[PDB]
Amino acid sequence: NVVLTTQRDPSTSIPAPVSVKWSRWTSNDVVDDYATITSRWYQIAEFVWSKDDPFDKELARLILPRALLSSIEANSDAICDVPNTIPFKVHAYWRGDMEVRVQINSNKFQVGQLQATWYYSDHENLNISSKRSVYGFSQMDHALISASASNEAKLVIPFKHVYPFLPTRIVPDWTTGILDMGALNIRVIAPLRMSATGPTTCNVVVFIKLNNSEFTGTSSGKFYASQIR
Amino acid sequence: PSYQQSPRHFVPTGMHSLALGTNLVEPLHALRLDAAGTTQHPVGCAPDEMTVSSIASRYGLIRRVQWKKDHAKGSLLLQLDADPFVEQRIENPISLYWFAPVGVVSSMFMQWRGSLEYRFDIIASQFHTGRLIVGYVPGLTASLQLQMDYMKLKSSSYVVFDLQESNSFTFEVPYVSYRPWWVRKYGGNYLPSTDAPSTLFMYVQVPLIPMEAVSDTIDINVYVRGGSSFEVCVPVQPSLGLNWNTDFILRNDEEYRAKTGYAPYYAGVWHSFLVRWQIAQWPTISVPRGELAFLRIKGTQPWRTMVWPSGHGYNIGIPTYNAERARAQHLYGGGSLTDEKAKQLFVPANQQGPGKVSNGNPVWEVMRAPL
Amino acid sequence: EESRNTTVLDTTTTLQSSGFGRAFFGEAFNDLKTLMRRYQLYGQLLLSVTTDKDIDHCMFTFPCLPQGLALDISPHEIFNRCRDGIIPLIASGYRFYRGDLRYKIVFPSNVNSNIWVQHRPDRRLEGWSAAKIVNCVYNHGYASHIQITRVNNVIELEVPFYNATCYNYLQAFNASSAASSYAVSLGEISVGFQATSDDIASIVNKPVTIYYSIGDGMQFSQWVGYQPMMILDQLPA
């Protein structure tokens, strides 16, 4: 029931092909699809972007299976109020492919270009502090948002991790790095360049669909700890 | 049955080849349990990607060029070299650089050839109107790096672009050279072994005339991708290293070390001779005629003081209680180790102690004193 | 999009491709995998007897990975001078990997004792520190092999992929997730001698070199751009 539109054609940058269901190899519990409720789109980060932000500057390092929950627990309510994420509350183990849109609403007279890049397991590297820059993330496939034409960045992100399931709460073999797939990071390339009488603000909204998800390992919702701030 | 037929007549060698990486059956000792076993990739684990042209068909952002309103109708924007080795400097005592992926995967080879499609993405509105040459001159040396302008550029191959409703174009840099390939610009750490084959240029043919509602300045981004005919051949020592470990160690000589295979040492005894690693060698201190030398570093006690030829072909370092017994006046003054004066200055054997070794090869300090 | 192409403004005629050196040199190079199987120095150590070790005692242990070691630069003049070699420079360009490795460990001349070598897929890798060669027992059920020094002092190995994973991390590993330490190395190779305490004293400060290469099983995953690079001639004399 969430239907969203854009006036401009997207620029998708699919990193990897579509993956298999993966329910045959490590789950005998009721592996239930929730495409009627979890495939809704959901706003997880909006932010102001003005011209004071310099050339090579981060805007949002969204960790996407976390940020779907982190926007909720940041936005003054628990998981049980949002119908997208209640199977994370009930079930313990998650898998699934993501869809990510980064809409802009820039005026046409503005000149600028954001980039959106998906990276796999940012927090599982220490050297990303050397890489967290536009020149590194340009080499891998990445979407681009020109503030001239107010382009939109659709971005299919298939699930690819070392283990074929991301857990949703504290789990007996790892705790730290819960439900972490990697970084959606929105790096500025061309900053806002306008006249003296120019429109300074440029808000950026990020939506996320979660379609080919599977949830397994039903357990009690009182076990689910809050995500990290 | 008796096998009396005369047998083979071979040559042994100790090791299989190393540079061979191709249609060649390599025998090993697998720690796998199965002889027919091979690591496998199930239905999701079949990996997406590996190929030189798979790397060379990726744009890498390599140059930010500011392009202002008041740049004149001949002003230079970049004179950057038409190799894949594009210089992008990041602001340590060594410096780090971005490169195009075609730049690095060129830097893991000796030679390259083929086109180089540089993409100029000129970020502007449709209200800005511009015009700029992307020229290309084959074969300009360093002394010919000057004398360059658009009027002398248009003799060579050039592409004039109008910045309008479309804002992006990928120019394809030709490969024009006398040689079928082209040697790597940088090479190993080796001061000889050559600049670019050819040079790109980008001059502003008609300056930016913006509208008064938009900005005077315009970013121009310059991407580099290897062309469709790009190919590299000879695998040599790479000219680029990672920044996982940017630590570097100089090798000036005014520093000391023990010789190779003789550190760590420990204070102990020796029946021919305190003094071991089998006595540990030490470098011969370059002492001219009329000086003396003693050592102080940068058993029962830490031995911070310690060189003379043993007589068995290599130097020894004798431990002393202090720099006073060490302070070499007897030995450089004409004495010998068998002297009673020398044997009193030596440390007796009882100070061997538990004998904990030195940490690696500890750099001593060479004190040179007049005699 | 990264690899898009807005407007081609080519001046060139079509170049004759050499077929990646096949026409000149009689061999292709486009496939980088066939370059990867060229051996590269993995890590060189110096033997150092600490205790009067038992025959069971491993002389050194090291995790086994195609990422290249935590680089150990009296510096080693290769790792002081020739930074990183080839295979971690390619392996910088891929976030994951999956496949075999080959080793071909080379031993010095003055050693004579028998050599046992283990693969241990039980061992995790805790952080990028202590992911290097470590100078420290023999074990039963781990995959084992003895090379005899007297026949030939160079063992060779095909260490397989034993992980319960889809693939493994290829960049340098900070140990964020606790179970992710199970998914970086292929395991842990240990080299130990059968030398007694008297004869191992002669072998102190002798170099033991280990090489590596992938061996046709390796298949790298999703592309990641390169990190910042250091230019080697800029290093001081």
Residue numbers in the entry:
A (entry chain B): 21 to 44, 46 to 250
B (entry chain C): 3 to 51, 53 to 94, 97 to 198, 200 to 279, 285 to 286, 288 to 289, 295 to 315, 323 to 330, ...
C (entry chain A): 2 to 74, 79 to 141, 150 to 250
What does the article say, verbatim?
The genome release of iflaviruses can be induced in vitro by exposing the particles to acidic pH. We show that acidic pH induces expansion of the RNA genome in the DWV particle, which, in turn, triggers the swelling and flower-like opening of its capsid. Native virions of DWV at neutral pH are uniform in size with a radius (the distance of the center of the mass of a pentamer from the center of the capsid) of 135 Å. In silico simulations of the expansion of DWV capsid have shown that residues 1 to 61 from the N termini of VP2 subunits can change their conformations and mediate attractive interpentamer interactions up to a distance of 7 nm. Therefore, the N termini of VP2 subunits enable the flexible expansion of DWV capsids and the deviation of its overall structure from icosahedral symmetry. The capsids of genome-containing particles being larger than those of empty particles provide evidence that at acidic pH, the genome exerts pressure on the inside of the capsid. After 30 min of incubation in phosphate-buffered saline (PBS) with pH 5.5 at 34°C, the capsids of 80% of DWV particles were open in a manner reminiscent of the opening of petals of a flower. The opening or removal of a single pentamer from the expanded DWV capsid results in the formation of a pore with a diameter of 190 Å, which is sufficient for the release of the RNA genome without major unwinding of its putative secondary and tertiary structure.
The icosahedral capsids of iflaviruses protect single-stranded RNA genomes that are about 10,000 nucleotides long and are polyadenylated at the 3′ end. Subunits VP3 of DWV and SBPV have 160-residue-long C-terminal extensions, which fold into globular domains protruding from the virion surface.
